[PDB]
């Protein structure tokens, strides 16, 4: 009966070893024979970039009052890939039943839900493209990426606002200030005619020790957010003719603490 109790502890440390099938014989110089290098560490693997969720602005083209003629297009997005599927809130079809997130499952939204804590920075790469569908091409314009800090009152909502800049007599110094802010901890600026890509790293700045990597709601992960906006000319108020391509990786201090268990999954199509 002692042998039946000791063999019942968790982990199977009381099981009887049973003279295994064959032997283990691997040489150190097997990596030089196959594949060149090794893949034994997931922390190194997560530092590569993955395509994710090209960003558009096709949600404000519904109301018949959207500005045209050299306006500013702004999108506010969370700091994390916000896993694929029909998440409860959804940034891609909000004013229609069952909103969804038209994205792809990256290497960050696959290994994360198997954990208890998450902390660290995220790196992004935004690549600009866009046409005019007639009305022969205009210059690219200007692009900015800035942070949105936490404030108890009057914080910026999530995504897809458009602001005008001109009047009967051209540019207005007043409307050009209502479409911007102090940018006291934010903006990185560039001109898209000589540089179309934007590289940025966003720190944690949590005031808490960690967050839940099992979060699914779009707004719950959107507690830390940032914004990408572009200034373009000769736009149309009922069409979406510009977009960004987002590539996401892990920062220099990204951490995952306690491996709890592997959650379920399925095949999702849109």
């Amino acid at each position: 009966s002692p042998l039946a109790i000791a063999g019942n502890r968790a982990g199977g440390s009381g099981a009887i070893t049973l003279e295994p099938f064959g032997s283990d014989n691997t040489s150190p110089e097997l990596s030089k024979l196959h594949f060149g290098e090794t893949y034994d560490h997931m922390r190194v693997l997560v530092k590569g970039y993955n395509f994710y969720k090209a960003v558009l602005d096709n949600t404000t083209i519904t109301d018949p009052d959207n500005p045209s003629g050299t306006v500013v297009i702004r999108s506010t997005v969370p700091d994390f890939p916000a896993p694929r599927g029909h998440i409860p809130n959804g940034p891609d079809k909000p004013f229609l039943p069952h909103p969804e997130n038209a994205a792809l499952c990256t290497h960050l939204t696959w290994f994360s839900p198997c954990y208890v804590a998450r902390r660290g920075g995220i790196r992004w790469k935004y690549l600009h493209f866009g046409a005019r569908f007639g009305a022969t091409d205009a210059p690219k314009g200007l692009g900015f990426v800035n942070r949105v800090p936490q404030v108890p009152y009057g914080r910026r909502p999530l995504g897809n606002e458009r602001l005008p800049l001109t009047d009967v007599n051209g540019f207005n110094p007043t409307e050009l200030s209502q479409a911007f802010s102090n940018e006291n901890g934010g903006v990185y600026a560039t001109d898209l005619d000589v540089q179309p890509a934007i590289e940025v790293e966003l720190p944690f700045y949590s005031s808490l020790r960690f967050v839940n990597p099992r979060w699914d709601d779009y707004e719950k992960i959107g507690i830390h957010r940032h914004s990408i906006d572009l200034l373009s000319y000769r736009t149309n108020g009922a069409k979406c003719e510009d977009a960004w391509m987002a590539y996401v990786a892990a920062g220099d201090d990204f951490n995952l603490s306690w491996m709890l268990s592997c959650p379920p999954f399925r095949l999702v199509n849109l």
Binding site: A4, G12, C105, R123, N255, F265, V268
Partner: protein, 278 residues
């Protein structure tokens, strides 16, 4: 602007977008902080629990056990009958159907199976553990057979292939590990084309499958076949024709497990299975 430069010219290679494939070279990015040296800790101890090691190492997935399924013994069984049959590869799916009131589906994998999805090649050993749930008055003997390649379409001998005979006495919960016994260095990783994967092991009571016939033909992704046969019939005090006994098995990865590739098969899966049928 007093002097002039007499240094030779050079070549540039602009590289507007940068390197998005390697993971060891420095990057020319713009940190959105106050200082360029801002940095947190990687301690794993700031959450409240002492750490046994780097939890981001892949070894923590190869080595976490998991209960899979159960099969019966059914004492009214002849001396040579198949009880269990499986393929030796980490990708073993389990499909459920949302017991509560709605229509939803999902799938599960062991910790070893989960971690090898983003990869395309695998090699190493795997560990199995069988536990019999019986009283102190049950007696019997079982057999475990391994076939490196081809499958076991008929009852084998006792020494032609590797065999083990274990008896149900005062000791249960036997474990065994299968090593690499292929002529190739690496094998492939199994995938699924739909939401209802094909059967990878024979009867499992949790998934409502009870066919005892041997399935096969998965040579290109597996490391052989495991089978369980009766040797001595199960003996119970009360009387047969209505008595059974259940055996539970667990899967794991041996310390010699390995994966080396990068794959994009999970690019359209999702962990949000909650409401996707409508």
């Amino acid at each position: 602007c007093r002097p002039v430069v007499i240094d030779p010219p050079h070549k540039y290679r602009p590289t507007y977008v940068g390197n998005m494939a390697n993971a060891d070279i420095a990057e020319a990015v713009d940190k959105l902080s106050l200082t360029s040296k801002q940095e947190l800790t990687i301690n794993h101890d700031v959450i409240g629990k002492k750490s046994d090691g780097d939890d981001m190492h892949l070894s923590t997935f190869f080595g976490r056990e998991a209960y899979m399924d159960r099969f019966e013994w059914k004492t009214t069984d002849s001396y040579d009958t198949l009880l269990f049959y499986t393929h030796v590869h980490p990708i073993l799916f389990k499909r459920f159907e949302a017991t509560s009131g709605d229509y939803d589906v999902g799938m599960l994998l062991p910790p070893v199976g989960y971690a090898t999805i983003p990869f395309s090649f695998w090699r190493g050993g795997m560990t199995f553990r069988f536990s019999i749930v019986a009283s102190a008055f049950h007696r019997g003997r079982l057999r475990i057979v391994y076939q490196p390649q081809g499958g076991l379409g008929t009852v084998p001998g006792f020494s032609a292939a590797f065999n083990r005979v274990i008896d149900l006495g005062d000791a249960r919960d036997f474990e065994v590990t299968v090593e690499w016994n292929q002529n190739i260095a690496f094998r492939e990783v199994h995938t699924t084309g739909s939401n209802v994967p094909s059967a990878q092991y024979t009867p499992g009571l949790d998934v409502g499958r009870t066919s005892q016939l041997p399935l096969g033909d998965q040579t290109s992704v597996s490391n052989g076949v495991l089978a369980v046969y009766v040797v001595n019939d199960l003996v119970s005090p009360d009387g047969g024709t209505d008595e059974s006994v259940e055996v539970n098995w667990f899967v794991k990865g041996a310390p010699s497990f390995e994966v080396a590739s990068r794959d994009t098969k999970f690019a359209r899966w999702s962990t949000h299975w909650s409401q996707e049928e409508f």
